[PDB]
Design a protein around this ligand. Structure first.
Ligand SMILES: CCCCCCCCCCCCCCCCCC(=O)OC[C@H](COP(=O)([O-])OCC(O)COP(=O)([O-])OC[C@@H](COC(=O)CCCCCCCCCCCCCCCCC)OC(=O)CCCCCCCCCCCCCCCCC)OC(=O)CCCCCCCCCCCCCCCCC
Ligand SMILES: CCCCCCCCCCCCCCCCCC(=O)OC[C@H](COP(=O)([O-])OCC(O)COP(=O)([O-])OC[C@@H](COC(=O)CCCCCCCCCCCCCCCCC)OC(=O)CCCCCCCCCCCCCCCCC)OC(=O)CCCCCCCCCCCCCCCCC
Ligand SMILES: CCCCCCCCCCCCO[C@@H]1O[C@H](CO)[C@@H](O[C@H]2O[C@H](CO)[C@@H](O)[C@H](O)[C@H]2O)[C@H](O)[C@H]1O
Ligand SMILES: CCCCCCCCCCCCO[C@@H]1O[C@H](CO)[C@@H](O[C@H]2O[C@H](CO)[C@@H](O)[C@H](O)[C@H]2O)[C@H](O)[C@H]1O
Ligand SMILES: CCCCCCCCCCCCO[C@@H]1O[C@H](CO)[C@@H](O[C@H]2O[C@H](CO)[C@@H](O)[C@H](O)[C@H]2O)[C@H](O)[C@H]1O
Ligand SMILES: CCCCCCCCCCCCO[C@@H]1O[C@H](CO)[C@@H](O[C@H]2O[C@H](CO)[C@@H](O)[C@H](O)[C@H]2O)[C@H](O)[C@H]1O
Ligand SMILES: Nc1ncnc2c1ncn2[C@@H]1O[C@H](COP(=O)(O)OP(=O)(O)CP(=O)(O)O)[C@@H](O)[C@H]1O
Ligand SMILES: Nc1ncnc2c1ncn2[C@@H]1O[C@H](COP(=O)(O)OP(=O)(O)CP(=O)(O)O)[C@@H](O)[C@H]1O
Ligand SMILES: [Mg+2]
Ligand SMILES: [Mg+2]
Lengths: 564, 564
């Protein structure tokens, strides 16, 4: 009931479309149900009168049936459209709402949740939920109403035969459900064993570097073959039980129809029924069987949509553990760009056992370049993550001009901070759209503004040297760029943003004489007149930095000029 | 025909099972097809003789039909089992063969191919192909034979009515195919637009760090909402065309049956047919419709299995671009463990534009420790990749005791080389199974051997301090370990292998006083009496190394003792 209230409200804006479509589905289903009754009376009329010409009755009946069919087709067309479009609007409202919630979440959420699971929830579960309260709801509503009218019409036509069907079907069905529960058991065994075999396979393929290195390729191939040979053994046993079941199911099914043909046949011989009346009964009994299969599927789909519903309302009602757009903004006079770390203790959420900062304190003063130095994996890159407030420190404070960055609006805080990554990220957009991304409104930036920053960041040469120029679609689903190129576009983006604070994570790892010069020249133009925090790789940038801070074992172990 | 020859040979070892099951499917399908004919004659017998008692005929017919049904059920059970088990053996042979080919491939293959695609090919495509040459083949073979017997029986019963059905169904079907081609168009448009919207979504979620950093969360949420609002617009248009189609399809379907009921009804009135003979004809016409739907699905599944077949024979016949187990092995006297790089030029296959080594030459002499030193991303780790021959140099040679490592058996070459990674890889096995992995036969290693190396690698304390001890299932699908723990298990593995050459990639990045000591102590015991190549992070290991080699800009820029 608390879950059903959510599904009802979901379908609520579409209440009038779904009420009209269900109204058309009511008409069609019920008018359709009268056919076995009228076919029975026609069968008996023919039987009674083999000497009567029925051509004019047939012509009128078939002419009249055409108009009923033309209406039913026009009713069905409308019903389908109203149903499909109702579901589309529901799936649209679910997509916009789920995406909105996901982006609002803290970084830590994405550290613990896989993108594939979020995309599967935004693609498949939004699809399930939409068609569960629409197409499936109508599917089960028709099948439910058709078994209702069907069973009623079986008792109407013959209470003896209907009571007989009713005494035979449930016992047989119950025994078949039990065999079905045994079959499900042998199936999960086989599919659990197959999951293990696939996990073994997946793991070894994923880490073929370690398998090679130990000469265990032939060992794993044989280990896997042994596992899937055993699955075959379980599948053969599961195949014997499925053969027995299908054979028993078919026999029961046939013998139940043979029972009703026999019992009905005897009742006909005793003048308890006509051939028409029997034809009529068997058509309804067949219609009931389909309606039970219809209610059966509807349940399996309603369960699926409920499982999907739980996964969606999970993310739809998740409150980000870090503020999204709340807090204060600083005055023009009050904002100077001075930053301070005071006794920062931090360990990443995925590995909370590994401390990155253990009493980290660093004062980056306004307008001065500060070069961060330390061994590999010391936690230099994590400094930019904490400044952008992607995470909050466990202990201590990060302050901007004496204000705890926690009290400020994070979106605003990041509007003041520009960043140049080790390996920058470019979306599958144009080069110009990627540069425009720096601006507080990438729509307000003129072609001339994008061309200016591209010249200053030394990117205009390679961009213009591309077939489509600034309209060259980059990213993953586009034209692949070098690190030096990606970094210069990251500089162009930062130039456009015009931030008071700049955070550079140098990429001296991947650089050649041609790139490394135009990048160092662009980075010099960029650094000019900003509070800079540079993670220094090149000894040249350490040398002319106002201060050097050494990060060892999660703390600032040394602090002074390159000489001192 | 060249593809059909591969599918035939695939089913060939199961030829006798599939021939028996098809023989049972032939019996059942054809004996089943006679029912509308005999139902027609029974209908006419009743019609002609309303005053005759048929109780004893009915009882005998229903008793006889029970024995026919009991046989048919026993025939079907056998058929299903033979079919299911034939497919299981085919799917087993495909699994073992595909996995064998994958593991044999060079590392570069895995650098360019995603694990998900290889697992989907080993799970879903092995399943498709198996049931395509079995269950689907029988499905289409029955439906193909049933339309054959069905159409034949329609002309037998009434050539006028069958010729009539034949003149009406194809035109209507042809027009419906054209509308179906138009419907497919509007569907691909909507689903292409939805793919774009999902790619946008997937990309932004995947890189929420860059979206946050530019305060573009609200911008992307609105960008996505705009895209999926437009999909709704396309889906509404696609929904109108689907409504029109379904309505037209239903009308055509109903009016075709109304035509045959009318035409057949008129022929009855003219004494061209009996009611039984008409009942008979309509049952066959209904059976043909199902058989055409059966051949239709069979085609869609045969195409799917052929698409799967192309993807499997791709990897099944791929020749690894690097030898798997071929080459020479060196004599006990000839193998000393001396290594040499001479003018090595190498760029990784995924990024062939980025050179890692540009005339790299380094002589690591037998029994001496050589410490590799260089800036981050200089290509220090790539040295171990080339020594293990995961890749071959583009230019130059890597030699073992004067022998080009290319002329040697790579499995044997790696049996001489032990390795300790930055972040070691532990499979979802027991700690003991993971340690045993070092041995040339992890089955031949006694509990005492695994316990010895665990003591020496300083791992026995934390292992024994685990609830299940050496039987503690580690890896991803198991108990998560620290880097220091994973590294000490990597030392235990190397100790057991007992290699003449050892390649260490130090992890000074993640280390605390307790771990860093027991690891440095275990690594000292391990280094003892081996040709060592250590990528040095700790200044302590550089100091007591026989030689230090500096890697700058893809070459050995400096070479000498720590002091010199
Ligand atoms: C793996 C798969 C499985 C493998 C195989 C497994 C094993 C297979 C086998 C399984 C077992 C099969 C057993 C079959 C046994 C039956 C055989 C049989 O009957 O054969 C002929 C049958 C012949 O008897 P008959 O006199 O011809 O038929 C008697 C009928 O009772 C007819 O009575 P009647 O003709 O006198 O008329 C009934 C009468 C009386 O009305 C009714 O009977 C209608 C009753 C409907 C009840 C519906 C109730 C629904 C629920 C209501 C409550 C709602 C919820 C309330 C709250 C619940 C609690 C919270 O109708 C009305 O009054 C109509 C109005 C009321 C409706 O039995 C035999 O001849 C013996 C055969 C022995 C073999
Ligand atoms: C989006 C969905 C779609 C939306 C809607 C789209 C639009 C919908 C509408 C579409 C169009 C519908 C058009 C319907 C027109 C037909 C209406 C009609 O016929 O109404 C009654 C029909 C009445 O005529 P009837 O005399 O009662 O029936 C004449 C029949 O021909 C009967 O002739 P018969 O009774 O004299 O007997 C035939 C005779 C002669 O045998 C046959 O006719 C059998 C012919 C079978 C041929 C099979 C050939 C298969 C292939 C062979 C070759 C293999 C490949 C070789 C190599 C190929 C090249 C590489 O049978 C035999 O000899 C039997 C043995 C041979 C078999 O027409 C009208 O009354 C006019 C209605 C006007 C409206
Ligand atoms: C899948 C599991 C197996 C399914 C179970 C199959 C069981 C076999 C079914 C037998 C059906 C015949 O059932 C038989 O029907 C007739 C007609 O109603 C009954 O006959 C009796 O009642 C009818 C009225 O109803 C009278 O006209 C008749 O004179 C009288 O003998 C029999 O008493 C009954 O036994
Ligand atoms: C597996 C095969 C199963 C076949 C189906 C069962 C058939 C069993 C044989 C019984 C059929 C003969 O039984 C006979 O049917 C006719 C047709 O309804 C009945 O006839 C009755 O209804 C017809 C209308 O249909 C009237 O025209 C007629 O005046 C009236 O007597 C007879 O009173 C009955 O004796
Ligand atoms: C979905 C698209 C729409 C479907 C198309 C529907 C078209 C309408 C079908 C009309 C069917 C009636 O077709 C009609 O059959 C009777 C009986 O065979 C024919 O009747 C003629 O031949 C029969 C013998 O076959 C003689 O007994 C009869 O005396 C003579 O008039 C008519 O000449 C024919 O017109
Ligand atoms: C949408 C509704 C469609 C309903 C189906 C079509 C019915 C159209 C009306 C025609 C039926 C009456 O037509 C009549 O059928 C009976 C039964 O076969 C025929 O009767 C014939 O076959 C029966 C056996 O079935 C014999 O017992 C009889 O000796 C013989 O004459 C008549 O010769 C024919 O005139
Ligand atoms: N989201 C995350 N969750 C868990 N661990 C993470 C993480 N992001 C980074 N790490 C780990 O934190 C440690 C320090 O990260 P960081 O990137 O700050 O250091 P670094 O910049 O010193 C490495 P490099 O020398 O390559 O630039 C590393 O061991 C890294 O694997
Ligand atoms: N399979 C692969 N395909 C493409 N590029 C790869 C790669 N494996 C590594 N690289 C890249 O090659 C470069 C050098 O790699 P490598 O791991 O050898 O250096 P390193 O050991 O100096 C880094 P660290 O200081 O973190 O240990 C890096 O820029 C890395 O991203
Ligand atoms: Mg870094
Ligand atoms: Mg490395």
């Amino acid at each position: 009931l608390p879950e059903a209230r959510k599904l009802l409200g979901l379908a609520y804006p579409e209440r009038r479309r779904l009420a009209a479509a269900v109204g058309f589905l009511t008409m069609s289903s019920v008018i359709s149900m009268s056919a076995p009754f009228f076919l029975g009376k026609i069968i008996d009329v023919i039987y009674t009168n083999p000497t009567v010409d029925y051509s004019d009755n047939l012509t009128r009946l078939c002419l009249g049936l055409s108009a009923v069919f033309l209406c039913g087709a026009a009713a069905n067309a409308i019903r389908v459209y109203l149903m499909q479009t109702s579901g589309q609007r529901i799936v649209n409202r679910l997509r916009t709402s789920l995406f909105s919630s996901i982006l609002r979440q803290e970084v830590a959420f994405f550290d613990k949740t896989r993108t594939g699971e979020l995309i599967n929830r935004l693609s498949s579960d939004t699809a399930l939920l939409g068609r569960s309260v629409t197409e499936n709801l109508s599917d089960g509503l028709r099948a439910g109403a058709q078994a209702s009218v069907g069973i009623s019409m079986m008792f109407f036509v013959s209470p003896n035969l209907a009571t007989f069907v009713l005494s035979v079907v449930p016992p047989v069905s119950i025994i078949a459900v039990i065999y079905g529960r045994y079959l499900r058991k042998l199936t999960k065994v086989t599919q659990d064993s197959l999951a293990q075999a696939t996990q073994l396979a997946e793991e070894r393929i994923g880490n073929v570097r370690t398998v090679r290195a130990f000469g265990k390729e032939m060992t794993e191939i044989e280990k896997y073959a042994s596992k899937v040979d055993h699955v075959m053994q379980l599948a053969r046993k599961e195949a014997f039980a499925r053969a027995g079941f299908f054979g028993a199911t078919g026999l029961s099914g046939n013998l139940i129809v043979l029972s009703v043909l026999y019992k009905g046949g005897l009742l006909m011989g005793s003048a308890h029924m006509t051939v028409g009346e029997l034809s009529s009964f068997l058509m309804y009994a067949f219609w009931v069987g389909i309606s039970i299969g219809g209610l059966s599927s509807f349940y399996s789909e309603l369960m699926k949509g409920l499982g999907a519903g739980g996964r969606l309302w999970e993310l739809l009602e998740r409150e980000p553990k870090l503020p999204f757009n709340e807090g204060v903004i600083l005055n023009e006079k009050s904002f100077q760009g001075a930053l301070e770390f005071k006794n920062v203790h931090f360990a990443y959420p995925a590995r909370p056992e590994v401390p990155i900062f253990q009493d980290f304190s660093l004062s980056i003063p306004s307008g001065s370049v500060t070069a961060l130095v330390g061994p590999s994996g010391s936690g230099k890159s994590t400094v930019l993550s904490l400044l952008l407030r992607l995470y909050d420190p466990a202990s201590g404070t990060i302050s901007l001009d004496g204000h705890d960055i926690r009290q400020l609006n994070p979106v605003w805080l990041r509007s003041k901070i520009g960043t140049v990554s080790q390996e920058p990220i470019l979306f599958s957009c144009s080069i110009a759209e990627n540069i425009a991304y720096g601006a507080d409104d990438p729509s307000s930036v003129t072609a001339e503004e994008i061309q200016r920053v591209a010249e200053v960041a030394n990117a205009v040469a390679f961009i213009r040297n591309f077939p489509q120029g600034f309209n060259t679609v980059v990213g993953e689903k586009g034209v692949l760029l070098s690190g030096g190129q990606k970094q210069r576009i990251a500089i162009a983006r930062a130039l456009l943003k015009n931030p008071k604070i700049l955070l550079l994570d140098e990429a001296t790892s991947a650089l050649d004489a041609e790139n490394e010069y135009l990048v160092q020249e662009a980075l010099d133009r960029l650094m000019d007149g900003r509070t800079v925090l540079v993670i220094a790789h090149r000894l040249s940038t350490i040398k002319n930095a106002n201060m050097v801070a050494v990060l060892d074992q999660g703390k600032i172990t040394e602090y002074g000029k390159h000489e001192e």
